[PDB]
Design a protein around this ligand. Structure first.
Ligand SMILES: [Tb+3]
Length: 137
């Protein structure tokens, strides 16, 4: 019954910014954390193609209180995660967007995660369907 609904993806010029949101419904979030994952460019060519649409990598994560965060190294100083516990919503502020930030971004919930910031896709219970971030040069 838990549902995660992302918004905020769009078409933006490189160097621009987007703010993603994830609204959680269908349960209580008083534990664990949530995270943003994105499609993984598993063959390291600079593009998502073929079956990489199903691959996932961690971007940013936050404990349920907002008290703890972590980030993939290559988004540090550019992206900021935050959460409004009273509204059960999580945000990703994406500044200084780069072309290779282009991907679907997925909201992920891990209410039972004991170290606050979930980083592995297998530890996630619930996934949103994503929002597509498209960065143009
Ligand atoms: Tb690729």
């Amino acid at each position: 019954q838990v549902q995660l609904q992302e918004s905020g993806g769009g078409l933006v010029q490189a160097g621009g910014s987007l703010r993603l949101s994830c609204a959680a419904s269908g349960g209580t979030f008083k534990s664990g954390g949530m995270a943003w994952f994105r499609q993984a460019d598993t063959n390291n060519d600079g593009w998502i193609e073929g079956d990489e649409l199903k691959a996932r990598e961690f971007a940013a994560g936050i404990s349920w209180s907002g008290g703890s965060t972590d980030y993939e190294d290559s988004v540090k100083g550019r992206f900021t995660i935050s959460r409004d516990n009273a509204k059960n919503t999580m945000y990703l502020q994406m500044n200084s967007l780069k072309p290779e930030d282009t991907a679907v971004y997925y909201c992920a919930a891990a209410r039972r995660f004991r170290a606050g910031v979930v980083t592995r896709a297998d530890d996630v219970d619930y996934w949103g369907k994503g929002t597509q971030v498209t960065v143009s040069s």
